[PDB]
């Protein structure tokens, strides 16, 4: 899957970032964050299967990538608690979203690739 994919790379080692926890939240009508989906990156640094076309409705989503546990498992003390990405999804109908992240101990960058299925 499918409509929402996350890909994570490590800029120190030149590798996929493997076994990174990713948590997705959706803003509820009362303005709180409701848990939506979560998972871990594979050996290729990718996380497929978060959601389905049925479940992934319009809304404001937050994707939190647990960069802190990643670095700590490699024995490194990182700066950021996580890398987040917050965006409005599916406003003009369903789209496929890939959230890509590139990690360093004191920096991260993220991009979105949005395609019309």
């Amino acid at each position: 899957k499918c409509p929402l994919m996350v890909k994570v790379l490590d800029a120190v080692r030149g590798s996929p970032a493997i076994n990174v926890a990713v948590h997705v939240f959706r803003k509820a009508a009362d303005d709180t964050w409701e848990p939506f989906a979560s998972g871990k990156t594979s050996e290729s640094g990718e996380l497929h299967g978060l959601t389905t076309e049925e479940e992934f409705v319009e809304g404001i989503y937050k994707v939190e990538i647990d960069t802190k546990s990643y670095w700590k498992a490699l024995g490194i003390s990182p700066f950021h608690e996580h890398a987040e990405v917050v965006f409005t999804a599916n406003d003009s109908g369903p789209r496929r979203y890939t959230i890509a992240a590139l990690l360093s101990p004191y920096s991260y960058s993220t991009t979105a690739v949005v395609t019309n299925p």
Copy 2:
């Protein structure tokens, strides 16, 4: 001078001017308490957010309102904002600069932590 934010625009090749920035500190109940805020200057910098006495160790979030910035320029943005969350640890003397580089569908952020 303990906390400074600096923002650049990767589309126009310029400082990101008049961008709203809010800083929050994580409270004991895990909620975010507003801590400081301002708007970037003509140089894309925001100085004077806090003081040495106020800025204690803890977990902080710097939220940069990128969506309003892109909309004021007529450019279509992806993200609601950019949120930068980090732990401040006392080691010896430190100044923190949070630097960010903005594009419509991407952003990057780095921390520059120096000893005055």
Copy 3:
């Protein structure tokens, strides 16, 4: 293919960067750049098939991504002439290299993912 792949994304549109020309050079024994391989990114922003295991020997390689023609075709006046990446390849035996690039009109970033086949 295979040992050398290039992937290009557009940070303005949130899309793959399609039909981007990529030229690869290898440093010759006289210290000049010898043409090595070239191609164009596909609809997915990827360029496979540049080289083969046989041809891709040790050496210092330059990958030049024609970012200027990309932007000009979209009607935009960009800053950089190209995005390059220069690196020593295969020094401790064959590796697979992915050179990924993220483009904006006044900025680019690049990362390398190196895996042991």
Copy 4:
């Protein structure tokens, strides 16, 4: 002040200090003629590369010796260097800053072009 380079280190969270920077201009035969060079300061900045009279329109390459920088820190690097190639165009008054953010297997660069 027409050309400045500023370099940051994404691993250590610091300015990239004592990094060698060479600038070349593209010659009529398509070769690169050395034009200016220096080493970044304690702030990671390199000022005084050129003068307004010298810096004419044309195609320039800023080569940042990232490999020597990482090796002096004991960190294993991927790239030989970082080469940043751009066209300078006269529009009205302009100052150029080439900013770069370094990691061992990645770098990014942006241009900040302002009107003094």
